[PDB]
Amino acid sequence: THSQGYRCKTRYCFARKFRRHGMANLTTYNRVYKLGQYVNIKVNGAYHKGMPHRYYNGRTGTIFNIGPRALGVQIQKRVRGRIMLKRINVRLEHVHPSDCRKNHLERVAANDAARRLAKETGQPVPCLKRQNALPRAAHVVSIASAIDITPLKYDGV
Amino acid sequence: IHPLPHKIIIKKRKNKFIRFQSERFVRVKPSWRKPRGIDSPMRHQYRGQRPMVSIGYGSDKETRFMLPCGFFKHRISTVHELKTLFMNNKTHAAQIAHGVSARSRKQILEEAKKMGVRVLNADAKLR
Amino acid sequence: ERATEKEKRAALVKDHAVKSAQVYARYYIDLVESEKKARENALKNNQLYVPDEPKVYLVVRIRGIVGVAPKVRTILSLLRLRQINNAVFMRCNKATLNALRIVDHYVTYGEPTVETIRNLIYKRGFAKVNGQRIPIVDNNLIDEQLSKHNILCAEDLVHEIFTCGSSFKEANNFLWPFQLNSAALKDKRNNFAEGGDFGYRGKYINEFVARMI
């Protein structure tokens, strides 16, 4: 790596998709953003102002500042033995809202909902904790249709 | 002249720790010195090297500093020191200093006999 | 008054134990009978009775602390396996079982029998009270730290560990990781399936740990 310019090794990263070359859909400029929202950063090749760096591509941050045209987002970049909060200003074309905590927001709502539903009917409270798969129960399986399977012979040569 | 019963006295190593290569050279004295060479076989404690001084070899606290008789040792130079230092202990025994002259060592032995204090070097300068 | 409370409490734990030891013994005997009857019913119907999947594994570290990979070391420290020949009980969930497969080369695991659990809890069991290794010689120490979880006596302890019950985490953490004698180990390099010793030994863990206790 003799040369290290702002856009080096960006042949594939800052290049548009097979049938996605063109002008940003107007939704990018119509999406409301609020401070503390999680936003994924993915560069758009067509737009060359407010472009973040290739490191920032694939990073998720919170919006510290909302500004007339670019939103300031703060990511955590591991520099050697310390993670540093890198505040960057990125134009709308390269900032996309992140589902990120969307699962947690759904869980908080569902856990509260299944608490009230119980207070009314089905009074025993439901388990609102995730269980990581767990072992299978004993069960019973019919072996009436069981088919014998045998190793097949070699035929390649 | 007989001490408290006490327990078995275990000496972890009977022989003294000798400095590495003290045997080859007279200039190197046998007094233990820690090996600090970049490539010292004794620092690396290879197989067959001489044993290294470590706190693990330390004697039991109960039997540390104890003479083979079973009494610890107190160094006496004058009759006042025997009376003050050996104030009714059954744990420690007396030992007159090398400097104390024969004449004084008779009056140090006599007071000791009256006080029933064991003197380890009783037969010293005796003529 | 404290001695009077201690005498009163000791009797309550002894009473709970004289009852639980008998209640739990029926549960273990019934479990063997229930699987046998379910199997008999299934074979008459041309069906097969699958038994229930194991809910607890006995993991024994069989490799040394030299040259351990960073992920391997981290996972082993969370299993509490910090020295060779150490043994711990772990729950069976995707989170534990995926981590255990990463460290398979360093460990041997299997479903433990109730007698294997009893022998480890009684002969080699030591508590973790105040971050100290306190030997479990009486039902009083277990009562003191596990009465909140209803694990008053040793029979409650060998039952919670075996059934992987609600108070399994508390029960397991109360036990300092077991320190065992050196394993026989036919081959430390290969998996028990390839004929070595590492990885899943299944029911054979009971035999493997037997000598080590």
Add this chain to the structure above:
Amino acid sequence: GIDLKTGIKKRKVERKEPKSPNPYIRLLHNAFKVVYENTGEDFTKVLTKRLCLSKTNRPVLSVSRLAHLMHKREDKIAVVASTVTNDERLVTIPRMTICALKFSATARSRIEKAGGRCMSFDELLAEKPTGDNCVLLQGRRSCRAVCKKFGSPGRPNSHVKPKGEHKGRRGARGRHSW
């Protein structure tokens, strides 16, 4: 071999005993520790560690700061683990009961004239060993000139003054002069 180098993160150094040659400070630390052992009152847990602190850790508290701190609580006995000092700027000191390791002569006269009682740690142990009706107050630790210069001056976000006189253009007149 046992792997004790994973979730274990070394040991910390906390001064468990006062390095003070003064016999008085050692006499109080041992006393306040004895009270703490028998009754684990947290007021005594702090006082025991406030007597083990260094001079730099134990900053001075003036009778002006103490007046402001005890504005709503005149009845409560201020407990300071350092020197109480006078503030000539405050013309009128309110009556206050203060217990300290030392009171400056100018401060001691002022508190007594106000009608307040200057207590001592031995007096506090005799009357309120557990610390009832007493507030453990502290001076500003980072008021020392040494603390102001800690850091790397000449780094963009440092905001600290350089140690020497320097008196030159490069690096000082803004980010560009570097």
Add this chain to the structure above:
Amino acid sequence: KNHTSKNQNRKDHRNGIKKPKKSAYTSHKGMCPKYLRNLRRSRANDPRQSLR
């Protein structure tokens, strides 16, 4: 050796991988001036107000 990255990730993870500290997330550095002036104007009223 002109260059080595060996051991560098052992040194980094020996006492490192450290969080960027609090008060860095809620810092007003790089926030729009007009928003910051509005915040100060709003704060200086009734319970939030800290002046005499």
Add this chain to the structure above:
Amino acid sequence: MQKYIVYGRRLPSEKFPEPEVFRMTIYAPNEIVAKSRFWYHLKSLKKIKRTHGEILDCQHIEENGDFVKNFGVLLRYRSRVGQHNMYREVRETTSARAMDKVYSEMAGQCRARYHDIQIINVKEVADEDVRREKVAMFTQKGVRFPHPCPYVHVKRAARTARFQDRAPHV
């Protein structure tokens, strides 16, 4: 070595309510090897990995050793050059014992380990059909053969009795 008939199926899914139950007879030293060899065959034959499947049962079969029976095993083994197929007949009391004989002869002559040999078929061959000359030799009722190794007895006895007055006659 023990003979285990192992049953297994894919996990039940919304796409297929009851996946097909498969049955294989695997000869292995223990149950854990038998369930591993089951999944090795299932992965290739029916595209079922262990994670995607369950083991319904691993039933161990008991086989009578009262009479020696002619047994015939069709297997496939990998040599360094490449894979090959081989039919071996061994006369043994039980089918597991015959599989042990087959595995030891394969290790001895073809230098092939258990893992690189797949057992396509194990059958009990009739006395009439014995393509291998060795099994055909003992099949006939009258088989008087002089002791193959009567040297072993005297050599074994001489280990305990190192020094003997006379050289032993065989």
Add this chain to the structure above:
RNA sequence: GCGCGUGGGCCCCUCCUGGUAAGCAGGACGGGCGAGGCGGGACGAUCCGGACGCCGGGCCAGGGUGCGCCGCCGGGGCCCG
């Protein structure tokens, strides 16, 4: 907060690059030696196990078990190391 040493590294795995190659010259995740005793691979800074207070008893890894040299026999197959 104050400081010290260090800033000639080397080796095994893994993908590497240049070169005909090299116990070659350069990269790299991890580990080792450096700065890890000890048993074993005949020998061997790094390989296989195992990482060290001082000892006594027991277990046993890795490697083996004719004799030097501690410790082996049983069975199946092959059979000019």
